[PDB]
Design a protein around this ligand. Structure first.
Ligand SMILES: CCCCCCCCCCCCC/C=C\[C@H](O)[C@H](N)CO
Ligand SMILES: CCCCCCCCCCCCC/C=C\[C@H](O)[C@H](N)CO
Lengths: 298, 39, 238, 247, 298, 247, 39, 50, 39, 49
């Protein structure tokens, strides 16, 4: 059934059992069911009123934490000098959530997750060290982060005219302010996001290039620029994006990833050269199956 | 405190204490009893 | 009326005709662990008459140069009787204690002893940075002697130690002291072989003066575990 | 206006804060939810599911060889078959289970576990084994006479192919820790050892070596606290295609 | 019994007493009881309605004050130069509350304390004085303080990948902001924190190294880094952590510490070379037991 | 939006402020509280417990010798035995008591104290002593005829080994101070002196020298105000292992 | 003012005026009277 | 959160402002008031004296 | 607006309009009338 | 075993009760002192202080 569990189960008292036809400690793993043997019928227990809560381990609390999803640096100077005719004080990012393994492995514990995304943008700034690198403080620059859905025009320069954003949502935030924050809704075309897609994203049967690419994971692009014109000195802007999911719903739990990730587009694996986390040996080796590695020397 | 119009803007909903360990631990057609011999 | 006292536990009994009173630590009495507070789920063993009884340790000789004595209160019994055997066969232990201290003299002898039970007396060392070794603290039934009783070997002070449960043995008035100690711990139970809840300390604050009488004046300590119970039965380890 | 002042911790971004924040797509209408099987509300639902233990985590054993233990006809009674280090933080047979993979995202734990063992020999093979759990405090039992003094279950091979050895919660404190110090009072849990109770007996034509599969899980009294970052994964460089997302 | 005492006790009037068998001023210190002789039976008192409150001296108010618990400085430069291949713009601290004696002595007035910890992080910054030490102001840098529980991976560099903190809680705070503040719950594995542990933290019987180390006082690590990349000039960052306990419960009061502390791991003592606070003489010396040192010269 | 403005003292961190602050571990479940003996709700519970006085705080007296006063058979009547400086801020016999160690964390105090004295001589030793408290204003009494004019108690050694001399609260102001100026109107408390009332008398074979232990405590009317930092401890350098915590 | 979900986040609870000086000053088995001779 | 904005005159210290401010000694108990003769409530009481 | 626990933290109390000019202007034992000859 | 600690005082007599601790309902006055049905035990006195 479905039970509400604010705390864990109590233990009840138990007594000597010597019955014919009753075998609580005997199971059958072939049925696909986990053993139902309880501690009170395995051993002679005392009563214990147990008040250990279960709130910290809720799925909403397990996943509802901000983690790094994107980080990228770019130069803030005058790039028009030379053979480059475009200002280029900006960058473009195609939104994905598979770039950093910490959040990725925590998401891939489920096949489908439905959540709203709380996005936090953390800018940092440094002064480039070259020749006349006489420090004069970090300027208080204003930055524009524009969400660009699929099919919308994408800026090609800092001074492009796509930055008016009559329809595209933008945030203007300064270096010295608190981090910018906004919520993206649950914006999938399906009922949930798929962490895994066992299929192809194209009707055409190409030989390779489209396995595991989910058609619905086309969230679009994030373009971030510096609104100010170039200063006489060059600075380096680093933008870190934190994603916190909320209102979370998760289905179909999966085995956690054990091999190190290799790409953001597939589940390819190689492991380490030796245990632990090796393609032949996930757990480290002990001398034999009769060896405690950490044994009390009495 | 939520003064935004869209309900998705709200805080997290970390409050759903219902559980069902039985879809995963005992997902069988015939319910297994306690102490009775499985198969 | 309050100068005579008889304590009976199991097959052991002690009488005294010049007691002062009985000290119950923090106005408390030993009791078994309730189900409300327990954490280990296996059924405890509760030997009552074989463990909850007085164990009389070796006596110490009170001299004019004596600095004082202490006993780590489970550790002093871990090798003694059915209590010790249960301690050895079980991972987890819990008890109170009833500590009775005996020291009798004449009406011409004089001196005072501070019988103080110190909870979690983490022992310090004088003039060194390295901590006390296993031997320095795990003295067993023999107990230890204070190096600097005036700071309780702890950098605190003897003068303030009267905040702890204590009694005096003033030779002109009384010849015994009795303190009853409940369970002191954060945890419901503990591994009796690696943590001591109490230290019974005997400190001669006023030095003994024989004045021509009998010189060999011994101090004797009898301790009874109270409401013993044990969990996590396994093989015996010492 | 309202007279106000700012407290310490203003303007901080704390990754565990819980506030509303401005909706970026106003009047957006999310796709209606359909029913999808297998909804998870709590992570303690998952650790209650059994998973195989790498009991045979030794050199030479590769891949699936690690998940199975060979039991074979003994020529010496009371023989020791194997033992399992009862640890989750360090590298051991438990570290392969779903229990240990979810638990390692947390620092504190409490409650009883269970280990289920499965006999995968022929029908004509009979045997009796004793599986003993030893509460901590000393060395691992190496003889059966010393091992049977703790919590144990005698498994007789029959029509039911699985036995369950419940690891009772026997701890001094309310919670334990996933400490790097395996020899610590707050971390050490004990030992699990298997001995031949009588023997493996097989007919003349049957195979004299058989396998056990071992599984472990939590029970309904198990709980986890103080969520941390699991040591089971880490980055050293950007993944393939990670920097290609910016072009 | 238990009485509620918003104020102190009143004094009542008293009168001449000359009774047989009544000796209020006579006690017996051997019973372990403090004298019960009241002022009204020691001397002939007047009535006094006394309205002196007792709120300032509550345990919650006695301990519930922020005090310094950690302070540490580190260099903010480019350490990759030379033979060092690691950026190292950070530090790691193993959390303890025994480093600074003021808070420590106030805590060790009790054996067990249960409290929630209000943590306040106060950053300061200076500009290193060397050669081209031409002042240009203090940059507004953003810092990340990450709590790392026992068993979690610990960063080894400023640019390590443990700083995503998908599960580890982190705070990002700037130099010019108010101090960062967050509450840590009562996070012991037991019902209370032990200020003193008369035992060993290991099942193994080693000769030395584990006396007084409480198994439950393993709170873990605090790692703090600078998020910004290095500037062309070097700065010195000083981080001060203040702990305020709250919701406090205290048991088993103890004699206050008199000898100066020597270590954070034991109660070892040496005292001063002469009184006061000497191993043979806590109180300073007067000429004899008949000498007032501060005597009115009438 | 709400029109607001910022008051002076915004963004300050004051170490005595009392506000809520963001929970770092959301949905954390603390360990349930068990009963532990000896709960302290107020610090005035502690100062009411007696503690020994270093009355014999002289050169030559080392360790426990300082906690006891020798009383011996006099050859001169009306003899002065000892005196105790009634001060808590300065270095004196009171400075060893738990009273003075908690009180020195505060600046102001009020209420009656008590000093309990204990006779630790032989049973066959008899004596009478007078313990006098002198309100401030003049010099310490050095003769018994001048000393008995104030608050005093005559102690006769018997089956009850302890006498109590209550120091009544006799002050012009409601509170006093722990000032460095012992000769100040707001700080000076008075004097305590002990004189032989008759003598110590002992038989031929008994010891002619005996000891007193002295204790002091607060009473139920005692109160403390204006918490400060106690002068009883201080740092000069980092402790051993303090900087090792960063590596 | 507490707008956090976790109750431990709240302000201090400096309000518990109950006292029991008797666990420390008179922790004896037989209660001592006033003026009556102790032992 | 509550959407707010700052008015002109924010962060000013005006020597005639009238607000509460943080208690530096929490749970401090002031000395009880005794009767002292000659209480003055208004300064117009004084200018009426010759 | 006072959200502090200690009542002394509050704003000023500029509200006590009671007056008694008579302790200073006519502090005599016998009350003086109006128009009647003083002494 | 079963013991009583005697402290000399105004009451000059102590009583050590020998409890009936026997396997059988009755014992015997047998010539074999080392017999199961006859041996009763030992009583010893030691200096406490
Ligand atoms: C006013 C908006 C301007 C700022 C826009 C910021 C957009 C950044 C979004 C980064 C993360 C979006 C995550 C969205 C969907 C899901 O997580 C993925 N489909 C993974 O399943
Ligand atoms: C969002 C969290 C990031 C910042 C984390 C800061 C952690 C700093 C904690 C310092 C003090 C913790 C005190 C904890 C426990 C007790 O006081 C000790 N066990 C002493 O008994």
């Amino acid at each position: 059934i479905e039970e509400v569990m604010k705390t864990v189960a109590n233990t009840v008292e138990s007594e000597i059992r010597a019955e014919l036809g009753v075998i609580p400690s005997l199971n059958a793993a072939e049925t696909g069911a986990t053993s139902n043997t309880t501690p009170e019928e395995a051993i002679q227990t005392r009563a214990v009123i147990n008040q250990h809560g279960t709130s910290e381990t809720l799925v909403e609390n397990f996943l509802g934490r901000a983690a790094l999803v994107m980080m990228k640096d770019f130069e803030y100077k005058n790039h028009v000098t030379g053979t480059q005719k475009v200002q280029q004080n900006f960058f473009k990012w195609t939104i994905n959530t598979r770039s950093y393994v910490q959040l990725r492995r925590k998401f891939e514990l489920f096949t489908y997750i439905r959540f709203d995304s709380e996005i936090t943008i953390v800018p940092t700034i440094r002064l480039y060290t070259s020749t006349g690198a006489s420090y004069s403080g970090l300027p208080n620059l204003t930055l524009q982060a524009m969400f660009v859905p699929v099919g919308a025009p994408t800026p090609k320069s800092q001074d492009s005219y796509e930055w008016q954003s009559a329809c595209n949502p933008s945030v203007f935030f300064k270096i010295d302010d608190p981090p910018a924050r906004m919520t993206i809704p649950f914006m999938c075309i399906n009922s949930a996001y798929g962490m895994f897609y066992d299929g192809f994203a194209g009707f055409e049967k190409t030989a390779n290039g489209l396995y595991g690419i989910n058609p619905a994971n086309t969230m679009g692009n994030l373009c971030i620029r510096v609104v100010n014109a170039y200063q006489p000195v060059q600075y380096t802007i680093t933008i870190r994006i934190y994603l916190k999911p909320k209102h979370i719903k998760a289905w179909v739990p999966r085995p956690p990833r054990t091999m190190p990730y290799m790409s953001i587009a597939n589940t390819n694996y190689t492991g380490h050269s030796s245990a632990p986390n090796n393609v032949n040996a996930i757990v480290g080796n002990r001398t034999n199956i009769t060896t405690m590695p950490n044994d009390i020397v009495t | 405190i939520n003064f935004y119009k869209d309900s998705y803007a709200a805080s997290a909903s970390k409050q759903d204490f219902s559980q069902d360990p039985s879809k995963f631990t005992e997902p069988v057609a015939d319910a297994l009893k306690a102490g009775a011999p499985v198969l | 009326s309050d100068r005579v006292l008889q304590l009976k536990l199991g097959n052991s009994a002690i009488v005294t005709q010049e007691a002062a009173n009985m000290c119950c630590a923090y106005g408390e009495w030993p009791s078994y662990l309730p189900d409300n507070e327990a954490t280990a789920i296996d059924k405890p063993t509760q030997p009552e008459t074989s463990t909850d009884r007085f164990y009389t340790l070796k006596s110490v000789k009170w001299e004019g140069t004596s600095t004082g004595w202490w006993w780590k209160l489970p550790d002093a019994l871990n090798q003694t009787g059915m209590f010790g055997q249960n301690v050895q066969y079980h991972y987890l232990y819990r008890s109170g204690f009833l500590c009775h201290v005996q020291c009798n003299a004449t009406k011409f002898h004089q001196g005072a002893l501070l019988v103080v039970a110190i909870p979690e007396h983490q022992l310090g060392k004088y003039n060194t940075g390295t901590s006390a070794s296993f031997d320095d603290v795990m003295k067993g039934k023999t107990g230890g002697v204070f190096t600097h009783p005036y700071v309780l070997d702890d950098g605190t002070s003897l003068a303030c130690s009267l905040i702890f449960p204590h009694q005096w043995i003033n030779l002109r008035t009384n010849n015994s002291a009795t303190i009853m100690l409940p369970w002191m711990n954060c945890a419901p139970m503990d591994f009796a072989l690696r943590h001591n809840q109490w230290t019974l300390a005997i400190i001669p604050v006023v030095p003994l003066n024989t004045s021509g009488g009998t010189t060999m004046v011994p101090i004797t300590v009898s301790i009874a575990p109270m409401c013993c119970e044990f969990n996590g039965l396994r093989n015996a380890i010492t | 206006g309202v007279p106000t002042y700012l407290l310490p911790g203003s303007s901080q971004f704390m990754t565990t804060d819980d506030h509303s924040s401005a909706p970026a797509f106003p009047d957006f209408s999310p796709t209606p939810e359909i029913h999808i099987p297998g909804r998870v509300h709590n992570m303690l639902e998952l650790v209650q599911v059994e998973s195989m233990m790498e009991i045979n985590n030794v050199a030479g054993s590769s891949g699936m060889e690690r998940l199975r233990v060979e039991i074979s006809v003994q020529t010496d009674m009371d023989a020791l078959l194997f033992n399992i280090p009862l640890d989750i933080q360090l590298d051991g047979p438990l570290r392969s289970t779903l229990l240990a993979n979810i638990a390692r995202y947390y620092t504190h734990w409490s409650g009883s576990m269970e280990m289920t063992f499965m006999f995968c020999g022929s029908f004509m093979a009979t045997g009796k084994v004793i599986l003993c759990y030893t509460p901590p405090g000393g060395s691992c039992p190496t003889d059966r006479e010393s091992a049977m003094l703790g919590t144990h279950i005698v498994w007789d091979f029959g029509l039911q192919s699985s036995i369950t050895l419940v690891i009772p919660w026997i701890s001094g404190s309310h919670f334990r820790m996933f400490n790097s110090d395996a020899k610590s009072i707050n971390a050490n849990v004990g030992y699990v050892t298997c001995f031949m109770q009588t023997n493996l007996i097989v007919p003349k034509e049957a195979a004299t070596s058989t396998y056990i599969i071992g599984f472990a899980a939590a029970k309904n009294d198990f709980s986890l606290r103080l969520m941390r970052d699991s040591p089971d994964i880490g980055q050293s460089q950007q993944l393939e295609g990670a920097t290609a997302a910016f072009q």
